[PDB]
Amino acid sequence: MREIVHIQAGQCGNQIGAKFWEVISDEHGIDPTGSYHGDSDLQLERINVYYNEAAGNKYVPRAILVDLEPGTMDSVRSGPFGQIFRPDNFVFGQSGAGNNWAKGHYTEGAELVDSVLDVVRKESESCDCLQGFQLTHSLGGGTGSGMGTLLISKIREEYPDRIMNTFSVMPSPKVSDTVVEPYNATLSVHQLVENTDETYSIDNEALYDICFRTLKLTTPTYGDLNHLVSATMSGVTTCLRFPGQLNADLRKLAVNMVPFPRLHFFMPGFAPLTSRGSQQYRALTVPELTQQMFDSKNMMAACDPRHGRYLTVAAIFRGRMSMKEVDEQMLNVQNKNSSYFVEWIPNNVKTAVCDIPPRGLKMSATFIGNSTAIQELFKRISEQFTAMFRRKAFLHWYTGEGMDEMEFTEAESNMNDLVSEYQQYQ
Amino acid sequence: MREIVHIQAGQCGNQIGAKFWEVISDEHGIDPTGSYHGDSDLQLERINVYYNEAAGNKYVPRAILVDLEPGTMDSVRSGPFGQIFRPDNFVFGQSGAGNNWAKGHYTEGAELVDSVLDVVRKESESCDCLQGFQLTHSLGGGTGSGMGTLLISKIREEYPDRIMNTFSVMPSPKVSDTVVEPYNATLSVHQLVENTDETYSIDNEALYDICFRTLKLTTPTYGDLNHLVSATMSGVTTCLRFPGQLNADLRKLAVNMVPFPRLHFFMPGFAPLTSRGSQQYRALTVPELTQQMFDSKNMMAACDPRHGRYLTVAAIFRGRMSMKEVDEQMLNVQNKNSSYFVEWIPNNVKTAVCDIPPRGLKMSATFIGNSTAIQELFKRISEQFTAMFRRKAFLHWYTGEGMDEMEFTEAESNMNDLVSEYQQYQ
Amino acid sequence: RECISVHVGQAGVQMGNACWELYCLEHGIQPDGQMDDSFTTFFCETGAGKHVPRAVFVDLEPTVIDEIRNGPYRQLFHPEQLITGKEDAANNYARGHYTIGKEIIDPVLDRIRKLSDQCTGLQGFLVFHSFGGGTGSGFTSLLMERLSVDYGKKSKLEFSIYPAPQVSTAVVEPYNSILTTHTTLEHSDCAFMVDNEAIYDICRRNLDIERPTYTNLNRLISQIVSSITASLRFDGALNVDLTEFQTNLVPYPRIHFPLATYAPVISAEKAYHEQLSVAEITNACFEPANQMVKCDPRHGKYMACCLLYRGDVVPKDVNAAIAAIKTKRSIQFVDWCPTGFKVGINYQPPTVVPGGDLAKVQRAVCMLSNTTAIAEAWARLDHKFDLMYAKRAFVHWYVGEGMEEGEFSEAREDMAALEKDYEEVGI
Amino acid sequence: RECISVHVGQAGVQMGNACWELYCLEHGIQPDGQMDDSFTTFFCETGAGKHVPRAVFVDLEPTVIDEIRNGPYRQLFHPEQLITGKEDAANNYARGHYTIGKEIIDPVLDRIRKLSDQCTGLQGFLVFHSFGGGTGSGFTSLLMERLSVDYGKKSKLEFSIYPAPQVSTAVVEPYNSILTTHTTLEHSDCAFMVDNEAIYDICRRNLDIERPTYTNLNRLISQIVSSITASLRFDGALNVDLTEFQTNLVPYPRIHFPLATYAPVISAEKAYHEQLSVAEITNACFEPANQMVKCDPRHGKYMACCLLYRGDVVPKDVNAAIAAIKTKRSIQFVDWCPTGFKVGINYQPPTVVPGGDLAKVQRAVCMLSNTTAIAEAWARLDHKFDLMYAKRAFVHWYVGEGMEEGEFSEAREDMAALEKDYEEVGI
Numbered sequence A, B: 001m002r003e004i005v006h007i008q009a010g011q012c013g014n015q016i017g018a019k020f021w022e023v024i025s026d027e028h029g030i031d032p033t034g035s036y037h038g039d040s041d042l043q044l045e046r047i048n049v050y051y052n053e054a055a056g057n058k059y060v061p062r063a064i065l066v067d068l069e070p071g072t073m074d075s076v077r078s079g080p081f082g083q084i085f086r087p088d089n090f091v092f093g094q095s096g097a098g099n100n101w102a103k104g105h106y107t108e109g110a111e112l113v114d115s116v117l118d119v120v121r122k123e124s125e126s127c128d129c130l131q132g133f134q135l136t137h138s139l140g141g142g143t144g145s146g147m148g149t150l151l152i153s154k155i156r157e158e159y160p161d162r163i164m165n166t167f168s169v170m171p172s173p174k175v176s177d178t179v180v181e182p183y184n185a186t187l188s189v190h191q192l193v194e195n196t197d198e199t200y201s202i203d204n205e206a207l208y209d210i211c212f213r214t215l216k217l218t219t220p221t222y223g224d225l226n227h228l229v230s231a232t233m234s235g236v237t238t239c240l241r242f243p244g245q246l247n248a249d250l251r252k253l254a255v256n257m258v259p260f261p262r263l264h265f266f267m268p269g270f271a272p273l274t275s276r277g278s279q280q281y282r283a284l285t286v287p288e289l290t291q292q293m294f295d296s297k298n299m300m301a302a303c304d305p306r307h308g309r310y311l312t313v314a315a316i317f318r319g320r321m322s323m324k325e326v327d328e329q330m331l332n333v334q335n336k337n338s339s340y341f342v343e344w345i346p347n348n349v350k351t352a353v354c355d356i357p358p359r360g361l362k363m364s365a366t367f368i369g370n371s372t373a374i375q376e377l378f379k380r381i382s383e384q385f386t387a388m389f390r391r392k393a394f395l396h397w398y399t400g401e402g403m404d405e406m407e408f409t410e411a412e413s414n415m416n417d418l419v420s421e422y423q424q425y426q
Numbered sequence C, D: 001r002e003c004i005s006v007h008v009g010q011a012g013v014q015m016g017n018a019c020w021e022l023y024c025l026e027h028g029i030q031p032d033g034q035m036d037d038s039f040t041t042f043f044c045e046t047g048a049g050k051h052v053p054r055a056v057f058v059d060l061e062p063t064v065i066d067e068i069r070n071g072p073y074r075q076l077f078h079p080e081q082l083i084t085g086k087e088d089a090a091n092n093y094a095r096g097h098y099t100i101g102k103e104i105i106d107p108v109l110d111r112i113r114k115l116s117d118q119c120t121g122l123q124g125f126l127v128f129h130s131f132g133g134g135t136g137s138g139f140t141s142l143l144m145e146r147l148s149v150d151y152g153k154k155s156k157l158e159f160s161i162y163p164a165p166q167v168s169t170a171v172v173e174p175y176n177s178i179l180t181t182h183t184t185l186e187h188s189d190c191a192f193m194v195d196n197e198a199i200y201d202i203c204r205r206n207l208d209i210e211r212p213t214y215t216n217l218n219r220l221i222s223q224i225v226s227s228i229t230a231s232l233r234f235d236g237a238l239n240v241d242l243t244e245f246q247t248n249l250v251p252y253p254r255i256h257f258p259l260a261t262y263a264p265v266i267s268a269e270k271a272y273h274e275q276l277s278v279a280e281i282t283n284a285c286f287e288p289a290n291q292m293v294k295c296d297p298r299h300g301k302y303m304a305c306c307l308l309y310r311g312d313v314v315p316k317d318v319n320a321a322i323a324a325i326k327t328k329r330s331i332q333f334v335d336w337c338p339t340g341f342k343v344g345i346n347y348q349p350p351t352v353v354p355g356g357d358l359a360k361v362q363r364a365v366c367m368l369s370n371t372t373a374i375a376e377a378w379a380r381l382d383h384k385f386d387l388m389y390a391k392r393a394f395v396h397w398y399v400g401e402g403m404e405e406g407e408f409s410e411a412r413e414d415m416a417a418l419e420k421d422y423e424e425v426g427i
């Protein structure tokens, strides 16, 4: 019944992917060992859509952890929900790439893709009818950018008709955790623009901006940032996991948000975002959530939506709520701010609601936005790419693996192409 | 059978309008919920003339409460007879006018008149044959002066042939409860002089003077003043509500008291007015009521009738009484005081009696008087209007809504015109 | 006297569970599936002391179908009738029609045959769906085509939830509605439409519900669909059958788009304070804001109106009431059909759900009417379609299913013919 | 019916904490932050059994803002509403406007928008500040300009603490007051003023407090600001809204400077011995020394006076009382508005703080009135400004912020126009 197979790549993709299984384990009432201890019967109604049943009322996740380094699996296996994963799925290499896209794509990737394709083939045969795949990686580095982008092309060859979702965190200019980030970002987007049908543009800079303004966290760690992005992955797959008044599968939101084949880079968000020291002094009904959803300082991307125009918006909701207040609020945000919305579409909002909210909250929603303001983050990495590429700097490491110099220019031809697409419909 | 539809405007019109339904509910024996608990069968004989029948032997009033502020309806709904009114009839705005005629007539009125015209259309279609409308407002302020004067013009356009009654309380110079009172009074009379066919000139100053001299009230509130004016509205509509030896409908008194189209501003009164501590020391037959009716300190207007001459008089009576004493007393009041009555009419008195008096009294009457002494209250407000208008004071608020300066002068041309009419026939 | 029903999409089964619970409580049917002629037109007799409805719930997505299997009304419906798919339509007219529609229609086709072969008094079919999504556009348009070639002569009463001028749940619904209407124009004998924001306005000003949900929207809708077929269930002084709605409301074989409105809709506290009679409800049903569609009837002209009352209502006041409606000059009837009044009566009154938002009423009416008021609505839907069609937006998904840009032009010019047909007929 | 408030400067929040504690004790709101329609106009309803005020405290200096964070009324207010800066104004109109003002107004602008969007009965705004310092002059003049272009139509009720003729806390306050009044003349609908030595004289002769503090000054001031809005909170026999103060008191669009005075102000021991009725308070409110400004009303003429009573007070004696005020020849009303009386009533009486200096009273009144008595005050402030402006004293700081000597002349000639407007209108 539309089973989704999870797949992880890179250090960050395994961390946020690990947090994804943790947060959904709580609402489903899954123990760290694998047994069920929930309360509602609807949790078992669609537990198979991510997990696999087993003996003793045990449920094993349908995850495949892929990382070229071995230490990443040791940290994930020793986590709170590290033992629930299957030991056979922990496939990994020995010698890391060290922030090199050419290694994880050509030399170090070719020896491991044969070991992961047969595993996901086994998982795809176990389910009754698969819907699609969702992947977590990062444009920076070599593992998540190299290993993830490679098997995306192979999965497209093996499953061209199924949905190919991707949650890809991109770099930022002010927060730079890698010197070779724009080359990996420029080489990765050449594969993401053509192969996958969906993409979520997540930014680490905004993940630091979002925690100061509303959460008021004095000591935020990566685990706190993983809680925000993991909740977004749960909102997109809510209606098939629990019933609702209006269902919206991963395909139902893709057809509305992807007006063209190449324009599929979304912009995520989440609400309610409120600190623990100011939870009592805020309401939880629908109008405060609507204005917070469309707020500029709410999304986890560094893009200014006021500098552009939204192509389409999708706001998945959770929990029992009234439909009149939901529908009427989405009318005024597009009417009062018609300048920041394209006139060549009559309605830029996609609505959907569920009845079973997360634990600890009574009403919540997740934002999915495709807008022309995404180009400002793509040209700056392109400028950092073209600035470093024009002198042929930091290319001798990539050519040692047999990579051609023109492939960087072919990626550059794609880089200024996608930013020009959003400029066309602006 | 000549159904009358009630309508209210302004704070005072809702208060005295609320008291109007209260006093008539007692003589008809109507419960505060809506059921009947009276004793006489004639109360149901003409209960339809103001009320609407309903299931469970319930009777709902045919009233429409209109006020631009929402707080007035909360006080009326929370009253003793607040629940008997229909909930749908409680139409109202949000942002009050704040003593501004331009707001209630042009900007704040235009958005609400569409919501009240369809309601009275529903009530007018429910009755078999409507006679006319009676309204309660105040010349002071912006709500009763603005909203009331506006829909009076619209009702004339929709119902030009039916009777248009109005109970309008005017300001006074000594009791000044509003700084912008003469502008509102001068702008309101332009509509009342041309649209409505009847008008009752009530004064707040005399409503305090009347309570000191005969009632001897030590601590009079607005509710005590509402008892006097509410009883006056019941006397004018007695013969169609209960049988009588000589019937006088609202049209039967209008034809006698309105000798010209513009001369329709009456002057009300009521009797017997006597304190509780001096009730035993007074009789209740007809001659003491006659001399009390024509007394100068009996009416609820500040006009001196001795300073002018009565055009016509109408004294509706209630309760079983002898006709010889009634007819003979009206002869001597006009004969002995021939100087204070116009010689160009042979008889200035209109007689009519009913058999069913109010509860707690055996003989009573209500005064309706059109006299040339009414002009003294119109010129003083005109002097206050002209004194403030000659320097264009307190006009910048009215022009903000798009009102023209000449419309104040057009009202001024009407102001000195109506006072000159009564001077012609003096 | 029997009739088969079918529910499609998220919109279909969501009201189907809400309507059938209203049907069962009228005939004394407990939810467990048991307690002479009034229930035979919807409910069969399974041997002895047990019944089952004459309907089927079909939907590709399994979340709503299994909710009925795990819901309270489990034993009432058949297990096999709760048909379910394996792949979602996803706001795609094509995906629920060609790829995923072909591998599921064959269980659906033969089931209607055996369901009708056991029956003997089959009047027609009525389908509940919504063209505002993916499942109610493609799969609904396919099943009606395949049974039309089979049956043909039997009637088809469509019930779709159309989008509003400005409020909308989806974004691709002009493409979903413009494609499915190309097939609906020739095979649908009649199609009653309802707007999504209009029904909110019904419960806002009249029922004073500031925060309702879709469950409440289906209750008053269940009163509409049950009242039109109420004459067939119970006895009435002037009986009207299912084929009455075809001849008396369809002036031309292409113009088969009536409207719908219902009254009285009063709260519990307001029901005791507000009088209920034929006069006020007749003036209320013709009120424009009280209609279930955001279209001004003053702009157009009524081709014909079909009145149908319930409860203790004598035929005198209903005739005197419409005589007053004929005298109203605010409305305007078309010269092509002056006597466009069809009145009906049923002795059985409007029911009431325990705990429902609607209050008890001794009488009610369900007014259906055709007019050219929706001519601007089709022009509005066509105008917004030209904006996205000019940019070729959302086209790669439809051609990604198997279609092409050819029939997109066929649907455009078909609406262009439909637009001028309302303009020329309304002269 | 709702209204948003804002506090600026040292003067603003010092009375804001003193006024809001008076507001909360009236509605039974405990200081911890919890206990139907009377409190909705100031306090919200957050979910279940919790409220928050509809106001914000903004101030550049953090000493007063953090005192509220560490003060007793911590749990009552929102932690995010307590806005704080990082650099002080320092008696500079320019420093709180151009350098430091620009980097803090943007959090302040968008907060009022979302605070108003969630609201629906927003009547207007009222700001508490003081032009006698730096923060209440520049930043207050900036925020009112930026919301006036946005809103405009909504009212603005300013509450400033002006300096006395001879008593003064600062030395540069003529430059601070003359600059900020140039912006206040065009965008402020009305501005009630209070003098610093006058309120000391109120508690000196009447309340016999020889050694009070600013905390005591804010209590009786809280009675004034709470009494003008008391009609909107509780029920009254003659209701008056917030827009009543705009039309009835502003004769011309530039002359928008009323006065303020309050009575009775009696101690605890004197309250039991001194009779309380409408006659003595009406004669006391028009008493010149009992006013909150050191300006002789005998020198000028009252344009219009707005009376507003509280407690059990029948409308007979209030009309008879003002009738005696009309007969007094010691006062003199202007011929341009003879009937300049506006009386109001509220059934809910004046409250009392536990342990406060004010005693319990069964009735009170808050009398606001415009007049030309402050024409000499503006001439006095302008005269002392010419002494320092002639020597070009204290000018190097203002131009040291970014301004120049140009607008210094614009503020001077603006007062020169304002002075003669009071002289010609008072003829």
Ligand SMILES: Nc1nc2c(ncn2[C@@H]2O[C@H](COP(=O)(O)CP(=O)(O)OP(=O)(O)O)[C@@H](O)[C@H]2O)c(=O)[nH]1
Pocket (backbone or CB within 6 Å): A009, A010, A011, A012, A013, A015, A016, A068, A069, A096, A097, A098, A099, A138, A140, A141, A142, A143, A144, A145, A169, A177, A178, A204, A207, A222, A223, A225, A226
């Ligand atoms: N929101 C979070 N971001 C993270 C986290 N860990 C890393 N990152 C961010 O993602 C950036 C790159 O992602 P990765 O750490 O996975 C580098 P990767 O493992 O793919 O390559 P190698 O480790 O060199 O084999 C990294 O520079 C961080 O900005 C995390 O736990 N949470």
Ligand SMILES: Nc1nc2c(ncn2[C@@H]2O[C@H](COP(=O)(O)CP(=O)(O)OP(=O)(O)O)[C@@H](O)[C@H]2O)c(=O)[nH]1
Pocket (backbone or CB within 6 Å): B009, B010, B011, B012, B013, B015, B016, B068, B069, B096, B097, B098, B099, B138, B140, B141, B142, B143, B144, B145, B169, B177, B178, B204, B207, B222, B223, B225, B226, D237, D238, D239
């Ligand atoms: N005899 C009575 N007179 C009243 C009563 N209430 C007010 N008034 C008088 O009528 C005068 C103005 O009438 P209103 O109170 O209705 C002012 P209105 O509501 O029309 O405008 P807004 O309140 O500003 O929206 C008012 O100044 C009083 O002198 C009352 O209850 N009884």
Ligand SMILES: Nc1nc2c(ncn2[C@@H]2O[C@H](COP(=O)(O)OP(=O)(O)OP(=O)(O)O)[C@@H](O)[C@H]2O)c(=O)[nH]1
Pocket (backbone or CB within 6 Å): A245, A246, A247, A248, A249, A252, C008, C009, C010, C011, C012, C014, C015, C061, C088, C089, C090, C091, C092, C130, C132, C133, C134, C135, C136, C137, C161, C169, C170, C196, C199, C214, C215, C217, C218
């Ligand atoms: N008035 C009303 N409309 C409804 C209700 N349920 C669904 N709808 C409408 O139906 C439209 C979509 O219909 P469907 O084709 O059934 O949607 P779906 O079945 O979820 O299709 P997928 O997204 O592909 O799964 C929505 O836009 C809603 O506005 C309801 O209960 N009441």
Ligand SMILES: Nc1nc2c(ncn2[C@@H]2O[C@H](COP(=O)(O)OP(=O)(O)OP(=O)(O)O)[C@@H](O)[C@H]2O)c(=O)[nH]1
Pocket (backbone or CB within 6 Å): D008, D009, D010, D011, D012, D014, D015, D061, D088, D089, D090, D091, D092, D130, D131, D132, D133, D134, D135, D136, D137, D161, D169, D170, D196, D214, D215, D217, D218
């Ligand atoms: N009556 C009264 N006046 C006050 C009170 N508090 C402050 N003031 C007046 O406010 C004036 C200065 O106002 P502000 O602009 O707020 O002073 P500030 O915030 O300290 O400005 P900086 O010195 O730059 O920090 C002083 O001259 C006082 O006379 C008070 O509690 N009561």
